[PDB]
Enzyme design. Sequence first.
Site, PDB file in Angstrom:
ATOM      1  N   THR A   1      21.172 -15.306 -54.590  1.00 43.60           N
ATOM      2  CA  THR A   1      21.372 -14.357 -53.543  1.00 43.60           C
ATOM      3  C   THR A   1      22.172 -13.106 -54.124  1.00 43.60           C
ATOM      4  O   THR A   1      22.058 -12.711 -55.028  1.00 43.60           O
ATOM      5  CB  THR A   1      22.140 -15.117 -52.190  1.00 43.60           C
ATOM      6  OG1 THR A   1      22.012 -14.272 -51.293  1.00 43.60           O
ATOM      7  CG2 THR A   1      23.605 -15.333 -52.769  1.00 43.60           C
TER       8      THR A   1
ATOM      9  N   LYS B   1     -23.423 -15.062 -30.213  1.00 41.24           N
ATOM     10  CA  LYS B   1     -22.848 -13.877 -29.646  1.00 41.24           C
ATOM     11  C   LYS B   1     -23.207 -13.775 -28.479  1.00 41.24           C
ATOM     12  O   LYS B   1     -23.938 -14.815 -27.923  1.00 41.24           O
ATOM     13  CB  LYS B   1     -23.306 -12.533 -30.584  1.00 41.24           C
ATOM     14  CG  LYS B   1     -23.164 -12.768 -32.226  1.00 41.24           C
ATOM     15  CD  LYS B   1     -21.512 -12.760 -32.247  1.00 41.24           C
ATOM     16  CE  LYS B   1     -21.095 -12.831 -33.799  1.00 41.24           C
ATOM     17  NZ  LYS B   1     -19.664 -12.517 -34.165  1.00 41.24           N
TER      18      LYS B   1
ATOM     19  N   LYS C   1     -22.488 -21.859 -35.237  1.00 39.06           N
ATOM     20  CA  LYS C   1     -21.045 -21.856 -35.240  1.00 39.06           C
ATOM     21  C   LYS C   1     -20.420 -21.486 -34.202  1.00 39.06           C
ATOM     22  O   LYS C   1     -20.834 -20.529 -33.357  1.00 39.06           O
ATOM     23  CB  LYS C   1     -20.414 -21.393 -36.572  1.00 39.06           C
ATOM     24  CG  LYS C   1     -20.441 -19.900 -36.649  1.00 39.06           C
ATOM     25  CD  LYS C   1     -19.615 -19.514 -38.029  1.00 39.06           C
ATOM     26  CE  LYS C   1     -18.180 -19.838 -37.948  1.00 39.06           C
ATOM     27  NZ  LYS C   1     -17.771 -18.849 -37.532  1.00 39.06           N
TER      28      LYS C   1
ATOM     29  N   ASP D   1     -17.756 -18.826 -32.732  1.00 38.03           N
ATOM     30  CA  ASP D   1     -17.075 -17.916 -33.105  1.00 38.03           C
ATOM     31  C   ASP D   1     -15.558 -18.002 -33.474  1.00 38.03           C
ATOM     32  O   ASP D   1     -15.091 -18.823 -32.640  1.00 38.03           O
ATOM     33  CB  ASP D   1     -17.253 -16.782 -31.853  1.00 38.03           C
ATOM     34  CG  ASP D   1     -17.740 -15.506 -32.563  1.00 38.03           C
ATOM     35  OD1 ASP D   1     -16.732 -15.098 -33.213  1.00 38.03           O
ATOM     36  OD2 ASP D   1     -18.500 -14.792 -32.038  1.00 38.03           O
ATOM     37  N   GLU D   2     -14.686 -17.400 -34.342  1.00 43.31           N
ATOM     38  CA  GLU D   2     -13.404 -17.877 -34.671  1.00 43.31           C
ATOM     39  C   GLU D   2     -12.698 -17.950 -33.194  1.00 43.31           C
ATOM     40  O   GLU D   2     -11.892 -18.886 -33.353  1.00 43.31           O
ATOM     41  CB  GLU D   2     -12.884 -16.949 -35.603  1.00 43.31           C
ATOM     42  CG  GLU D   2     -12.138 -15.722 -34.894  1.00 43.31           C
ATOM     43  CD  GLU D   2     -13.552 -14.731 -34.669  1.00 43.31           C
ATOM     44  OE1 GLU D   2     -14.130 -14.463 -35.414  1.00 43.31           O
ATOM     45  OE2 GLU D   2     -13.489 -13.865 -33.690  1.00 43.31           O
TER      46      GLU D   2
ATOM     47  N   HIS E   1     -12.349 -20.695 -41.329  1.00 45.99           N
ATOM     48  CA  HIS E   1     -12.431 -19.326 -41.021  1.00 45.99           C
ATOM     49  C   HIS E   1     -11.404 -18.519 -41.554  1.00 45.99           C
ATOM     50  O   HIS E   1     -10.105 -18.916 -41.042  1.00 45.99           O
ATOM     51  CB  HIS E   1     -12.698 -19.092 -39.529  1.00 45.99           C
ATOM     52  CG  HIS E   1     -13.011 -17.796 -39.274  1.00 45.99           C
ATOM     53  ND1 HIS E   1     -12.130 -16.646 -39.148  1.00 45.99           N
ATOM     54  CD2 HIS E   1     -14.319 -17.185 -38.919  1.00 45.99           C
ATOM     55  CE1 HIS E   1     -12.770 -15.459 -38.782  1.00 45.99           C
ATOM     56  NE2 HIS E   1     -13.965 -15.894 -38.743  1.00 45.99           N
TER      57      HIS E   1
ATOM     58  N   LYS F   1     -20.290  -5.316 -43.238  1.00 46.44           N
ATOM     59  CA  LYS F   1     -19.619  -4.392 -42.314  1.00 46.44           C
ATOM     60  C   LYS F   1     -18.073  -4.708 -42.712  1.00 46.44           C
ATOM     61  O   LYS F   1     -17.305  -3.663 -42.157  1.00 46.44           O
ATOM     62  CB  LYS F   1     -19.667  -4.864 -40.820  1.00 46.44           C
ATOM     63  CG  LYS F   1     -18.878  -6.033 -40.172  1.00 46.44           C
ATOM     64  CD  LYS F   1     -19.450  -6.371 -38.867  1.00 46.44           C
ATOM     65  CE  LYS F   1     -18.630  -7.844 -38.503  1.00 46.44           C
ATOM     66  NZ  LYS F   1     -19.258  -8.406 -37.401  1.00 46.44           N
TER      67      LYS F   1
ATOM     68  N   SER G   1     -20.330 -13.646 -44.341  1.00 48.07           N
ATOM     69  CA  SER G   1     -20.803 -13.335 -43.208  1.00 48.07           C
ATOM     70  C   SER G   1     -20.325 -11.977 -42.513  1.00 48.07           C
ATOM     71  O   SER G   1     -19.097 -11.553 -43.120  1.00 48.07           O
ATOM     72  CB  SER G   1     -20.076 -14.442 -42.004  1.00 48.07           C
ATOM     73  OG  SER G   1     -20.787 -14.381 -40.839  1.00 48.07           O
TER      74      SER G   1
ATOM     75  N   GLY H   1     -25.093 -13.589 -37.502  1.00 44.39           N
ATOM     76  CA  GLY H   1     -24.847 -13.737 -36.359  1.00 44.39           C
ATOM     77  C   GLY H   1     -25.572 -12.665 -35.326  1.00 44.39           C
ATOM     78  O   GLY H   1     -26.842 -12.919 -35.157  1.00 44.39           O
ATOM     79  N   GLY H   2     -25.261 -11.563 -35.701  1.00 42.73           N
ATOM     80  CA  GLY H   2     -26.140 -10.341 -35.043  1.00 42.73           C
ATOM     81  C   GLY H   2     -27.320 -10.483 -35.570  1.00 42.73           C
ATOM     82  O   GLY H   2     -28.399  -9.964 -34.919  1.00 42.73           O
TER      83      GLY H   2
HETATM   84  O1  LIG Z   1     -17.385 -11.896 -35.622  1.00 41.33           O
HETATM   85  C1  LIG Z   1     -17.814 -11.532 -36.704  1.00 41.33           C
HETATM   86  O2  LIG Z   1     -17.611 -10.351 -36.821  1.00 41.33           O
HETATM   87  C2  LIG Z   1     -18.667 -12.602 -37.545  1.00 41.33           C
HETATM   88  O3  LIG Z   1     -19.158 -13.501 -36.877  1.00 41.33           O
HETATM   89  C3  LIG Z   1     -19.670 -11.673 -37.996  1.00 41.33           C
HETATM   90  O4  LIG Z   1     -20.574 -11.755 -36.917  1.00 41.33           O
HETATM   91  P1  LIG Z   1     -22.038 -10.930 -37.302  1.00 41.33           P
HETATM   92  O5  LIG Z   1     -22.821 -12.390 -37.889  1.00 41.33           O
HETATM   93  O6  LIG Z   1     -22.630 -10.880 -36.119  1.00 41.33           O
HETATM   94  O7  LIG Z   1     -21.771  -9.883 -38.251  1.00 41.33           O
HETATM   95  C4  LIG Z   1     -17.863 -13.252 -38.754  1.00 41.33           C
HETATM   96  O8  LIG Z   1     -16.875 -14.014 -38.363  1.00 41.33           O
HETATM   97  C5  LIG Z   1     -17.066 -12.088 -39.581  1.00 41.33           C
HETATM   98  O9  LIG Z   1     -18.159 -11.846 -40.602  1.00 41.33           O
HETATM   99  C6  LIG Z   1     -15.766 -12.572 -40.312  1.00 41.33           C
HETATM  100  O10 LIG Z   1     -15.609 -11.885 -41.562  1.00 41.33           O
HETATM  101  P2  LIG Z   1     -15.140 -12.397 -42.990  1.00 41.33           P
HETATM  102  O11 LIG Z   1     -16.348 -13.325 -43.126  1.00 41.33           O
HETATM  103  O12 LIG Z   1     -15.250 -11.406 -43.958  1.00 41.33           O
HETATM  104  O13 LIG Z   1     -13.766 -13.301 -42.969  1.00 41.33           O
HETATM  105  O1  LIG Z   2      17.832 -16.523 -48.716  1.00 40.25           O
HETATM  106  C1  LIG Z   2      18.252 -15.436 -48.009  1.00 40.25           C
HETATM  107  O2  LIG Z   2      18.171 -14.312 -48.518  1.00 40.25           O
HETATM  108  C2  LIG Z   2      18.976 -15.705 -46.568  1.00 40.25           C
HETATM  109  O3  LIG Z   2      19.615 -16.843 -46.579  1.00 40.25           O
HETATM  110  C3  LIG Z   2      20.161 -14.728 -46.865  1.00 40.25           C
HETATM  111  O4  LIG Z   2      21.072 -15.356 -47.827  1.00 40.25           O
HETATM  112  P1  LIG Z   2      22.567 -14.708 -47.910  1.00 40.25           P
HETATM  113  O5  LIG Z   2      23.289 -14.911 -46.357  1.00 40.25           O
HETATM  114  O6  LIG Z   2      22.898 -15.181 -49.165  1.00 40.25           O
HETATM  115  O7  LIG Z   2      22.217 -13.248 -47.734  1.00 40.25           O
HETATM  116  C4  LIG Z   2      18.063 -15.206 -45.417  1.00 40.25           C
HETATM  117  O8  LIG Z   2      17.379 -16.431 -45.415  1.00 40.25           O
HETATM  118  C5  LIG Z   2      17.487 -13.819 -45.307  1.00 40.25           C
HETATM  119  O9  LIG Z   2      18.487 -13.226 -44.761  1.00 40.25           O
HETATM  120  C6  LIG Z   2      16.438 -14.062 -44.500  1.00 40.25           C
HETATM  121  O10 LIG Z   2      15.982 -12.597 -44.172  1.00 40.25           O
HETATM  122  P2  LIG Z   2      15.732 -12.175 -42.449  1.00 40.25           P
HETATM  123  O11 LIG Z   2      16.892 -12.617 -41.775  1.00 40.25           O
HETATM  124  O12 LIG Z   2      15.631 -10.643 -42.456  1.00 40.25           O
HETATM  125  O13 LIG Z   2      14.380 -13.160 -42.271  1.00 40.25           O
HETATM  126 CA   LIG Z   3     -16.770 -14.562 -35.713  1.00 40.89          CA
END
Ligand SMILES: O=C(O)[C@@](O)(COP(=O)(O)O)[C@H](O)[C@H](O)COP(=O)(O)O
Ligand SMILES: O=C(O)[C@@](O)(COP(=O)(O)O)[C@H](O)[C@H](O)COP(=O)(O)O
Ligand SMILES: [Ca+2]
Lengths: 123, 123, 467, 467, 316, 151
Positions: free
Chosen positions: C57, C167, C193, C195-196, C286, C326, C371, C395-396
Amino acid sequence: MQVWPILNLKKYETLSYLPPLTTDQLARQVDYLLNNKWVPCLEFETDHGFVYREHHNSPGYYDGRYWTMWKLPMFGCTDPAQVLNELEECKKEYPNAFIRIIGFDSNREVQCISFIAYKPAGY
Amino acid sequence: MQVWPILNLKKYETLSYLPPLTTDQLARQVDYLLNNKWVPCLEFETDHGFVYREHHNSPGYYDGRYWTMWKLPMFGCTDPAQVLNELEECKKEYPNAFIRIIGFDSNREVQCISFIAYKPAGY
Amino acid sequence: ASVEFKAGVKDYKLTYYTPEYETLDTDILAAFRVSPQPGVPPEEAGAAVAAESSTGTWTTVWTDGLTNLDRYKGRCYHIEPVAGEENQYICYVAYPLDLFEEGSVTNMFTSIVGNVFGFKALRALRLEDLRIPVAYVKTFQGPPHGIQVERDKLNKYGRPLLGCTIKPKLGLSAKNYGRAVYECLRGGLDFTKDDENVNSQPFMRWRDRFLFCAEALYKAQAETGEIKGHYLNATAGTCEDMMKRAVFARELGVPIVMHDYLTGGFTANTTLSHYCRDNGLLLHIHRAMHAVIDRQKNHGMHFRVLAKALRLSGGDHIHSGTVVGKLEGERDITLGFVDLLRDDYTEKDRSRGIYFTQSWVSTPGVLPVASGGIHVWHMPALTEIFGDDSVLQFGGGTLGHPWGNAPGAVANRVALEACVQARNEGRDLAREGNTIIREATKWSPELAAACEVWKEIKFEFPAMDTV
Amino acid sequence: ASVEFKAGVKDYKLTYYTPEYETLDTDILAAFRVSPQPGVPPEEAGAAVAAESSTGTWTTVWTDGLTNLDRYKGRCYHIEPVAGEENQYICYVAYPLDLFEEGSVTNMFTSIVGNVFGFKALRALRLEDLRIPVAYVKTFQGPPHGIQVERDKLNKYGRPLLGCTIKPKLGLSAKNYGRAVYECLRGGLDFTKDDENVNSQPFMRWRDRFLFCAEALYKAQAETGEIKGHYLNATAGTCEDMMKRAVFARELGVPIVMHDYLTGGFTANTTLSHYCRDNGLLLHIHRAMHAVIDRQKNHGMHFRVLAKALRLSGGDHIHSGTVVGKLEGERDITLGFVDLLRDDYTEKDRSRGIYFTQSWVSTPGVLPVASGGIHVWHMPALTEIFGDDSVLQFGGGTLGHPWGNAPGAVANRVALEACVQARNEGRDLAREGNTIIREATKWSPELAAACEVWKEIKFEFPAMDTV
Amino acid sequence: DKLNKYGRPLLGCTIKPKLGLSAKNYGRAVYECLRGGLDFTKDDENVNSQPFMRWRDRFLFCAEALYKAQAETGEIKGHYLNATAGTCEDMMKRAVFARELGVPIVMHDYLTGGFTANTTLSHYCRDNGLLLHIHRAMHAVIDRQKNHGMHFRVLAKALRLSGGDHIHSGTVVGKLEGERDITLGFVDLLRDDYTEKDRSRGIYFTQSWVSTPGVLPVASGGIHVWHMPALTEIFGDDSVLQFGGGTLGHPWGNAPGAVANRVALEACVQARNEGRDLAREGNTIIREATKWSPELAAACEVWKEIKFEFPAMDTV
Amino acid sequence: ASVEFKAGVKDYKLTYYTPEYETLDTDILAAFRVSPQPGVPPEEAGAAVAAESSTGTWTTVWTDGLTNLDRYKGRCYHIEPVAGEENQYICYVAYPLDLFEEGSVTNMFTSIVGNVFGFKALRALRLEDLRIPVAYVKTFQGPPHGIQVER
Ligand SMILES: O=C(O)[C@@](O)(COP(=O)(O)O)[C@H](O)[C@H](O)COP(=O)(O)O
Ligand SMILES: O=C(O)[C@@](O)(COP(=O)(O)O)[C@H](O)[C@H](O)COP(=O)(O)O
Ligand SMILES: [Ca+2]
Ligand SMILES: O=C(O)[C@@](O)(COP(=O)(O)O)[C@H](O)[C@H](O)COP(=O)(O)O
Ligand SMILES: [Ca+2]
Ligand SMILES: [Ca+2]
């Protein structure tokens, strides 16, 4: 717009949505198999041509996946005529069978090839 | 290399990979049963010739094991002609049945003999 | 070896800058892109990051004398200037094996990425890559199944797999989801699938969705004779909710579920990977939110780091970008981490943004999923970039085909099998792609309609994350 | 109202740019900082983000006719240029209530932050703030206890609480952890804690740690007569591991546990908030990794967004920055989100980086925790900035005192009570702080030694995230 | 009575490469072996769950395979699915999943898993109607030498107590050591209710079993079709005969290997039951059967000269 | 790299005696004290042990072609004669990390001491030592507490 058919449209995994392979088209997949130094194998099936669930329905369990092995894997094989010969032999012995050609990669232990090379009558 | 066949190759447990038993061959198994002082019994089955799972699929449970008993177990029997006679009677009454001869050891209460003695037409 | 305790602050580089250090084969190695404030030696910035990511630290504490601070400390053991940037350095850090909890991606990220990116004395900081030693690799399950098992389970060889998100992302009812699903799978897609962000909502409750999509998918398998799946999202507010979706998926007998690993979180992901291994469900990952962390060159965490941690935690599938679609994904970087995702060994390669050689001691490989705004015209390029061990997701590109889902699916499945055949025949996908696609439309009127609709559609912009 | 289906791609602004829209009181409202590529209208960039975060994709899908796409769609309803930036805009988006899963921070982040930050057509994107409507607020538990309950449980009123992380972050054994803990609590600190990355490791297994720190803390309470706690970290690789630490904490009878919500993840956090409410454990939240997402102005998610989602998911405590210490935190922004963390109503206020008025319908407030390179000289400023409802946490400021833990704790507890007394008397903490501290050293030789050690130590740099 | 198999030794077959085969290839090899006339196939002792093949995958595909064998041939088959594992909890998860798939028989390596964990499995299989095949891996660490250790009859009697439906018992004639007289000895101890003292066969005490069920001896290890006669004469009907290399080493592949094996055995049973002398007429009986079985003929040509004859260590 | 399948028996040393092999830091290394029958080269006795504790059996099986038998095989990579004994040798065997089940002592001993000690072609056999690579070490819990904690 066309409606995609419903009746008698059973499909057979990779290549099965293209026009039936010509004799040369067939040759060319076999060369592709052998150019990647994969081991050819033939397999056939008379009864259960498509997957089903008879003995279990838990996730990932299907019946009809295994077909039966024609002879052994052709280890060593460097000649495509050999493979097309065995296809002809399997055909003459099992003309009511679906017959597929598969290709083993032994480094990954995965089938890298698999396609239908012969379907029975009405198929 | 030969490919072991796939269709119509149902098998009937002990002796069923041999060439069909001759009349003398059949007699000899019956003598063997009787020379170990085991009790002859015949059994027959018209409908379910092979095992299947209709009512349960738990470990150890199969349907189609039990066939139906022709008359009783031939206790006392010392004569093979008796047994072959009952075989003939069963056959005349049940020509569409698979018939088997079985042999009981009563000291261990286990069947020590069991083989197919008659199959119906197309079998 | 003891020395008196002298309270007060010192430089970090006194303890944590160690240029002559030879890394151990058990160490975890981090590659940081560091941008110090004005006035801050790269050495001291490097040192800071190592100290506050491992043992140290801001002032001397006496309790260090109780331990052997030399064997536990993170170490900055090499600095190298960044080409074409003022005041920016790669800093390498080695972390000893003992610092980490076996099998917890959570604990490894908590040290390495916990507090250092907010340091006042840095302008910016970015984890580019990490070298997980093999003995740490062995403490994780990894992928529930992995590429070999997945292909053997589904009986699918010789080609990329094909997928399709339903979709309208949101607002469809269950029964309509199911309708769309059947239509898409029956025309030749292997998977569809959730969709996420489709979880359980007022417009569509989850258990209703799972139910109908089972019927649908069981009808598509039955009509076509090839195995289907539909990624049923287990993502959920709590672990108990998540596990309830998994267990119902299990109970329906379907092959595959999905999870949104970063918005669900690594603790809950790991749990779900475990249950699919125990239960034989495939696990599609995903990567929603990843771009919040991984878009910028100057600040964040590279996607190769998130993918490696996914492979440890467990996924059968992960999204990997498309390059051509895209969303952003540079080809060379993308080849890079894909290799990190599927292979057992991957040598160092700065041209592809691999900073470390990486071994996986037969941890199963993960299937990349492309995708996002792709379509039939991108088929050739996709097959070339990713090869057979990928999932291509439309998908699309499916549901926007003019003739409906079935025909959209056929178009995509035909274009893909035309590229496989052409490839296997010895043709050049990069050179001959438009042609190959062109040829296939002469006999597939499904494809032809797809091709007409999207002929001019391209996605090309300046990328942000480059090498 | 139906129109024929016309496949193919259109502009997003056609459907998703809606400037005249009046937001509904049930809508979720997002504030995005958007940086479009060259050539991309701010309208269309705005529109893109709204569409692909709610219902839409890159081409027209027919399945929209099945639903009422108008009632589900995300909407860009206002754009405003960013002052002192070329090509950068605030874009506001409204998301209808139906899009979201009740009680899931995971689902709300999956839509709103899922895929849009990787869009090719954006250079950069940053979620600045979100307006959670009250009817969505009511679907979450929130804090297990909250400030009122926590103070009543522990019997602690009239001052900030005081804490202390055990140092060496890693590499101490259990029994030594316990030793440090007793010494720190017996000199006047209310709490001590597991360091964020102390989980269970080869140098110290968790169940051993919990055990000894119970003995320790029970000894400090007994000697001093005031209630103590020690934040026992439940952070873990899996939910089942996490729950095992909680349940053992419960079984020991101690007051408080901690969790690393982002590296554990929102799914597992929510689970743990639930169990502490059912089990009466206080829940201290650590925000490790937050700076990976929240450091940069141009790309990411502001910390006020992560805090709001923590308050929904559940935390009794969250780290909130210190302003004055080694990590970055601008005073005005920090006042801002602190207010968002503890209060029931917080009006819009762009000067403090609050973009939305925010109501909490009596969801309990969260106690801010200031930790990170602070010491006795910062006491005055801390008390002024945060006031009584805060936890002040002094790791190297405790364990680096020259005289050991007990005296370090006394120094910090005395400096704090001197600032309270001075404040309550009517003195100006900003004006008179050094003086106040000075006066207190005349009678506390513990404080005097602290003051001598750290007299010159300040942390002042150019900040990155500003308004 | 469960398996509906009477009148001959049972036949089994260990899948080879012992290690390094994937789950789907394990299933492939299983289906082919069972469809050619083997009653059972099995996990190799040291195939548990590993990087090249995780257990749950293996069980699943071997179920599929074995269900296809049964259905093609109409004779009940089984595949010993190894529950052996690192902890009891792991072991019990494998048994539970075999129970759930509805197969007949699992295995356990009683000494390296250990008697506590065996007795736990033996209980479960009783309560759940799984047959339980015992492998005796490590036994030769303790039982090879005359001067020091524990005789294998002692480990066999303890396995009977603990519970096993099957245990390996040696072959006599194969690649691992087992003297004929001592072997007839303990096999009697494993199967019968009463066995009188008999120092000629290494039985030092008369032993009664008050109707404890007898254990099927399992001959496995370096045997083939030419040993069929001897095996049948040494063990009789109540045995399992197991041919790993002797099945998967057949030139024409698994199905034919299996056929050669099952043909050889039924020919020795037919010969025996007619009144022929297996010790005197074995090579002849085998020779005769090759005239009509081309599968057997191929097996017999491959291993005509192969014998395994050395000075034994444990003798009386 | 494929070769035709030739059924029948071969010497073990043809596949599993590998004297020039450099051990990997993940391998499991076994030290055996091996006493061959009369007639049995140490090389073939060493090879038998390595094969029959790892991948091989007594006659060639076709299914080896389906894997990469080189990466899985146990390997006898050093023989050294034993001082003051006739016909007794130290044979060293390397086992690849993939052969083992993580966290199972029971699995490691089942391969390594499973079957080989009964081989007719050995008079006697003894496992003297084992080198457990660190990556395998990490799969185990180890002692519940251990010396430090206990005290
Ligand atoms: O909602 C969407 O956009 C998609 O289903 C694409 O739909 P389309 O098939 O209609 O494009 C995919 O989740 C994205 O591609 C995620 O990107 P990535 O794979 O880079 O995580
Ligand atoms: O490891 C560390 O660095 C700490 O314990 C600080 O130790 P000291 O008390 O010895 O500084 C805290 O986790 C950080 O402050 C996290 O930051 P934040 O609160 O911004 O998430
Ligand atoms: Ca999707
Ligand atoms: O690994 C093996 O070596 C075996 O499968 C035999 O395989 P093959 O069928 O290919 O010989 C058996 O387990 C041994 O027979 C064990 O011996 P024992 O029964 O004497 O305990
Ligand atoms: Ca900390
Ligand atoms: Ca074996």
